[PDB]
Ligand binder design. Structure first.
Ligand SMILES: [Mg+2]
Ligand SMILES: [Mg+2]
Ligand SMILES: [Mg+2]
Ligand SMILES: [Mg+2]
Ligand SMILES: [Mg+2]
Ligand SMILES: [Mg+2]
Ligand SMILES: [Mg+2]
Ligand SMILES: [Mg+2]
Ligand SMILES: [Mg+2]
Ligand SMILES: [Mg+2]
Ligand SMILES: [Mg+2]
Ligand SMILES: [Mg+2]
Ligand SMILES: [Mg+2]
Ligand SMILES: [Mg+2]
Ligand SMILES: [Mg+2]
Ligand SMILES: [Mg+2]
Ligand SMILES: [Mg+2]
Ligand SMILES: [Zn+2]
Lengths: 220, 25, 96, 129, 130, 59, 219, 102, 87
RNA sequence: AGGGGAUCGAAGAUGAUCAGAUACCGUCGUAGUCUUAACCAUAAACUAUGCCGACUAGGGAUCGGGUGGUGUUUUUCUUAUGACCCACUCGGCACCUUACGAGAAAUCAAAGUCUUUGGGUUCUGGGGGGAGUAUGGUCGCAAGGCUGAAACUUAAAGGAAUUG
RNA sequence: CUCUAACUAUAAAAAUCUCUCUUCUC
């Protein structure tokens, strides 16, 4: 296709120059991503599918002005998820911008073992939870190959995550798909927010990629 | 309707029923 | 911290509190009071025979305009009378 | 009134950890608090605490290092049979790879793994992870 | 109800900011300048543009004004900014090499281990009733 | 949308399309597809923007 | 550690005293700042000038560590410290922002004033809260010229000094720029007073610049 | 819902205060929800100060004032223009309306 | 974290706050990383050699960022007695 | 029931306004309002936030008490008080900012320390209506209070907030 | 870096309203 992608931010300039090789460097230093093309460059195989299209109306003096809210989940099934929620006039544009936001909001997840680690991680590391609106989602580790015991939206979010086995429990008005998916997103991103005995030792604070490679930014 | 006036109407029905019972007690 | 007691020797009040609260439900109250046996047209009965008394149709609600073709039936098991509905296009004529 | 002193101690630890501090001042400082913090020291969830004699129940000054994330008492010290230890660990601990249900057996106050090693069980005190 | 909407104001602002040395006080000369230095499509808009340009020029002549800027004005501002007094306004150039303090900052100087010639004075801790 | 895309591919400074009628419904409705900017007042309406009106017969 | 050449020299401390940096902190106080010392009976807390100079040299060390000069971006919204910032940006290769801050200048990448720096210097947190919030949103350190009454939320290493002086802010910027240039090595040795003057960073009301021009144009 | 965390009363720790009557409509309203206005004015307006001064014995009379604290109700206060409806973010402010004159 | 053979399966072993030992989230868009330049004998900032402190967004939001940095710099011999361990 | 009996005022009497007005505006006006005994036990009896206990965040004030000031006016020559000023502390009605916490939010410094769920403890609620109705007790002279369903009917009723 | 002043003040009457609500996907 046709894509030039002139980089307008320093992170984008470094990525376009090919100086950042893995998305782990972006996630580690809590770097701010504002160009989805960075995420496209780092993760070439981010699959996605629209969770829901919802018509939302505003009551004006003349008729009812209706837009559409698209709930898109993007991921690579290898420990990377993003949840975009967008509102727009035309449904196709709403889906495109929701994909854009979801790519912007990619996040890493910490898959773990239920017990007696043998192969690659199959489940989460610990129990995690999130709460959006009144919807509280509780993700609990499950034994190997136990499937994803979750509602279809949460199940498909875990599938996009790469988590193959997990138990779930949702409390509240899980009816609303955006709230449920946001709570699940909060939980799965909180999976890397739990300090664990195997994460106890301190590191040397490797210098930030835009400090060591500040020269290649700042287009002169 | 107000709960006040529904209460009062119930009290007046009890008025009549209590007088009737007192007559026939 | 919570309304219920938490001590290791507070089983009695927890149990009686649950027992007193159970009456707030409708299924439990119906099951324990035995309202189905005493007041319902059938006492714990899925089906019941009866005799047709007359042959009436009743108009529907506001959003739905029609007359549903029912039938008044006096039950044989106890003698109660209830209206019942014949469900299909041309089944009213079938029942005499 | 102060009913469960260990509850106050663990609540103070939780509050002073969530805010990001590195120290706590627990006032009443009973035996059970000392043993609980000693177990936490043995497993690393706590730093270098201290008993301050007052001739009146003493006090404790606790040093933290941010390694802990939650204490907590099971306020009704339920009689935990050796079969019910696993159920408590599943219901309380977040993962099977870590966490410790601190429970008081006749062989002292011990973490659940140590109690299972001694093949002895008693009442449950609290949980740390 | 003459308010001279966006286009004329912005065009006149740019005209002043790019051509101040050539602009004059007179409406007709500035009208000819607007004709030659700028391609205004119609002529009513040209007259409005020249009129607002003259008004802004008169305001500038009266004094400096917000928003617009040009080479001469910014150079004058920079030259005034570069003013640094030859005489010292610190290091006790006034008050015969003596500066007045109270006890507290005197102890500050003392504990800092520095000589710092001072002059003590109590601050009369009674505060003004305002 | 293909028509609008081609029109702005041709170098146009703005395109707009109104499709009015029974778009997949019995009730009438009008869809507007616009991109760029379209003026509406003054002979610039006559001088630059050019319009066309057509009828299409369906089933 | 730092060599003893970085101690509080008598002339530099004397300058700090003269600009009345210590004189005023507030009649009130917030427990985020222990830089207080010997609360004066006038109800005007004194600021520990040694701590202020230590903060100044720490900020200079932090700024000098940045490899590319123009990712040090300095803000000033209040009038009293506008000119100084510009002057600072003249000597050290920093980027100034005077007057208004045009919010969205750090997050929004479309604005023509979108600067994405690696450090932000703020003359007053209470007045430049917008810049502090932007730096929070975009993960940027905030070396703020905090007073003993200004808030310290989202504020990194904080130089404690006066914010009501018209003297303290300019001289603080002087010492900051002077120490940064000494750290870089443009200034050869850190003993000479760097001839240019503290009054260069002082505030200049338009009324007094007009008076100065009139005195200059009299002959 | 709570429109006013103070409930408008300004009581906070009394339970009951003694009511007062409205000056216009004589509404028995609690003394704290009885918005008060201290009308201090001249017994002779500025329209007749010159006339009174010219036609009065006791040269330079002090011209005594009149003082009255008016206890309005709240319906009258809305209607008699004493107090006005405000924005929900403006209801926060309790300072008087910024010193009518300096 | 560790596979049974002994290779790492974790990705991006995360940083931790240098003042509160709490990990730094990937999307913790309030946290910062300060660099303090090393100083040689004559006051020349040696380039490319410094010391880094990762301050979390939580302490920055609370208002303890500057105090924590003061303590942390005093511990590693950067500032002289700027922070007292006994308040 | 006994005492009083000014004002204001359920009922009532009218004079207006209206299509009607035995309602609101007005003038009179009993019971009542005020009391000594005896009943009544209900209120939007509201902070619609149970009580006891611990911890968590910054900013001022305010009330009661107590400490210190080389503090200021006081005047009884000096001092002792008192009254202020500054700092601190305990307890109370409260208040401002903020979310870094909680909520469906309005908002809460408690409505926080709750899916990372357990400090002790009492009472109450399980969709709306029927209904706080009937009945049965019990208290009351009476008014009515406490306790208190079902049959049946219904797909909602309701909370907060957003745009009109 | 220095301060505590100005002010008013209208209420007449106005009740009621029937249908019928209709998809948003690249
Ligand atoms: Mg019909
Ligand atoms: Mg136009
Ligand atoms: Mg026109
Ligand atoms: Mg309302
Ligand atoms: Mg009020
Ligand atoms: Mg009280
Ligand atoms: Mg009597
Ligand atoms: Mg009447
Ligand atoms: Mg009449
Ligand atoms: Mg009347
Ligand atoms: Mg009367
Ligand atoms: Mg009640
Ligand atoms: Mg109540
Ligand atoms: Mg119900
Ligand atoms: Mg009810
Ligand atoms: Mg009865
Ligand atoms: Mg509502
Ligand atoms: Zn009134």
């Amino acid at each position: 296709e046709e894509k030039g992608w002139v980089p307008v931010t320093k992170l984008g300039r470094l990525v376009k120059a090919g100086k950042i090789s893995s998305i782990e460097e972006i996630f580690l230093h809590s770097l701010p991503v504002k160009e989805f093309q960075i995420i496209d460059q780092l993760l070439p195989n981010l699959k996605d599918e629209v969770m829901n299209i919802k018509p939302v109306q505003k009551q004006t003096r003349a008729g009812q002005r209706t837009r559409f809210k698209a709930v898109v989940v993007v991921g690579d099934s290898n420990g990377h998820v993003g949840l975009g929620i967008k509102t727009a006039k035309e449904v196709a544009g709403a889906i495109r911008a929701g994909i854009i936001i979801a790519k912007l909001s990619v996040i890493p997840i910490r898959r773990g073992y239920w017990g007696t680690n043998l192969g690659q991680p199959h489940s989460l590391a610990t129990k995690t939870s999130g709460k959006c609106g009144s919807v509280s989602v509780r993700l609990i580790p499950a034994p190997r190959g136990s499937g994803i015991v979750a509602s279809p939206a949460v199940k498909k979010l875990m599938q996009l995550a790469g988590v193959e086995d997990v138990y779930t429990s949702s409390t509240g008005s899980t009816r609303t798909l955006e709230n449920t998916l946001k709570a699940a997103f909060v939980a799965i991103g909180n999976t890397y927010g739990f300090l664990t005995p195997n994460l106890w030792e301190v590191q040397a604070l490797t210098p930030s990629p835009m400090d060591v490679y500040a020269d290649y930014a700042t287009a002169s | 309707m107000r709960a006040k006036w529904r209460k009062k109407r119930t009290r007046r029905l009890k008025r009549k029923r209590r007088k009737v019972r007192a007559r026939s007690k | 911290g919570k309304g219920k007691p938490r001590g290791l020797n507070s089983a009695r009040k927890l149990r009686v509190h649950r027992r007193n609260n159970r009456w707030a439900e409708t299924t439990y109250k119906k099951r324990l009071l035995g309202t189905a046996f005493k007041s319902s047209p059938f006492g714990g009965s899925s089906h019941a025979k009866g005799i047709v008394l007359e042959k009436i149709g009743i108009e529907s609600k506001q959003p739905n305009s029609a007359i549903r073709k029912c039938v008044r039936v006096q039950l044989i098991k106890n003698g109660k009378k209830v209206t019942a509905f014949v469900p299909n296009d041309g089944c009213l004529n079938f029942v005499d | 009134t102060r009913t469960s002193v260990l509850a106050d101690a663990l609540n103070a630890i939780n509050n002073a950890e969530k805010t990001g501090k590195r120290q706590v001042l627990i006032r009443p400082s009973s035996k059970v608090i000392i043993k609980f913090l000693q177990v936490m020291q043995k497993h690393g969830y706590i730093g270098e605490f201290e008993y301050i004699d007052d001739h009146r129940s003493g006090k404790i000054v606790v040093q933290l290092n941010g390694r802990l994330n939650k204490c907590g008492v099971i306020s009704p010290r339920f009689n935990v049979k050796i079969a019910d230890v696993e159920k408590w660990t599943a219901n309380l601990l977040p993962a099977r790879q870590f966490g410790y249900v601190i429970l008081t057996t006749s062989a002292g106050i011990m973490d659940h793994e140590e109690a299972h090693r001694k093949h002895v069980s008693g009442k449950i005190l609290g949980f740390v992870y | 109800g003459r308010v001279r909407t966006k286009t004329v104001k912005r065009a006149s602002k740019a005209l002043i900011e790019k051509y101040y040395p050539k602009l004059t006080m007179d409406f007709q000369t500035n009208k000819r300048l607007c004709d030659e230095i700028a391609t205004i499509q119609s002529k009513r808009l040209r007259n409005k543009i020249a009129g607002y340009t003259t008004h802004l020029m008169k305001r500038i002549q009266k004094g400096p004004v917000r928003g617009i800027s040009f080479k001469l004005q910014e150079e004058e501002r920079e030259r005034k900014d570069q003013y640094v007094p030859d005489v010292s306004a610190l290091d006790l150039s006034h008050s015969n090499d003596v500066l007045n303090v109270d006890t507290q900052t005197a102890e500050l100087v003392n504990s800092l281990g520095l000589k710092l010639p001072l002059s003590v004075s109590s601050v009369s801790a009674v505060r003004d009733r305002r | 949308y293909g028509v609008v895309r081609y029109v702005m591919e041709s170098g146009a400074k703005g395109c707009e399309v109104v499709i009015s009628g029974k778009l997949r419904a019995a009730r009438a409705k009008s869809m507007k597809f616009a991109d760029g900017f379209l003026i509406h007042s003054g002979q610039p309406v006559n001088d630059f923007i050019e319009t066309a009106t057509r009828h299409v017969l369906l089933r | 550690s730092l060599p003893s050449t970085f101690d509080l020299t008598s002339e530099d401390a004397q300058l700090l005293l003269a600009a009345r940096v210590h004189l005023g902190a507030k009649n009130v106080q917030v427990h985020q700042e222990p830089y207080v010392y010997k609360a004066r009976p006038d109800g005007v807390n004194v600021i520990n000038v040694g701590k202020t100079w230590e903060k100044i040299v720490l900020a200079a060390r932090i700024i000098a560590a940045i490899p590319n000069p123009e990712d040090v971006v300095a803000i000033s919204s209040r009038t009293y410290g506008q000119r100084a910032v510009l002057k600072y940006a003249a000597h050290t290769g920093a980027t100034p922002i005077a007057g208004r801050f045009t919010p969205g200048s750090f997050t929004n990448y479309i604005t023509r004033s979108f600067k994405e720096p690696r450090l932000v210097i703020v003359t007053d947190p209470r007045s430049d809260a917008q810049a502090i919030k932007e730096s929070s949103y975009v993960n940027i350190p905030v070396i703020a010229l905090t007073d003993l009454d200004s808030p310290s939320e989202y504020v990194d290493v904080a130089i404690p000094c006066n914010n009501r002086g018209k003297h303290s802010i300019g001289l603080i910027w002087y010492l900051l720029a002077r120490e940064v240039l000494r750290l870089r090595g443009a200034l050869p040795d850190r003993t000479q007073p760097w001839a240019i003057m503290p009054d260069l960073y002082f505030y200049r009301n338009p009324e007094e610049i007009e008076q100065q021009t009139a005195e200059e144009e009299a002959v | 819902p709570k429109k006013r965390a103070s409930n408008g009363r300004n009581k906070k720790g009394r339970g009951h205060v003694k009511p007062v009557r409205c000056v216009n409509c004589s509404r028995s309203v609690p003394k704290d929800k009885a918005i008060k206005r201290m009308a201090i004015r001249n017994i002779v307006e500025a329209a007749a100060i010159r006339d009174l001064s010219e036609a009065s014995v006791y040269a330079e009379y002090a011209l005594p004032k009149t003082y009255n604290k008016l206890h309005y109700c709240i319906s009258c206060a809305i209607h008699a223009r004493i107090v006005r409806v405000r924005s929900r973010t403006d209801r926060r402010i309790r300072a008087p309306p910024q010193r009518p004159r300096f | 974290m560790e596979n049974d053979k002994g290779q790492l399966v974790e990705l991006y072993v995360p940083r931790k706050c240098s003042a509160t030992n709490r990990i730094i989230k990937a999307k913790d868009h309030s946290s910062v990383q300060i660099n303090i330049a090393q100083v040689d004998e004559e006051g020349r900032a040696i380039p490319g050699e410094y010391v880094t402190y990762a301050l979390s967004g939580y302490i920055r939001a609370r208002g303890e960022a500057d105090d924590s940095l003061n303590r942390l710099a005093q511990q590693d011999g950067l500032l002289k007695n700027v922070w007292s361990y006994s308040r």
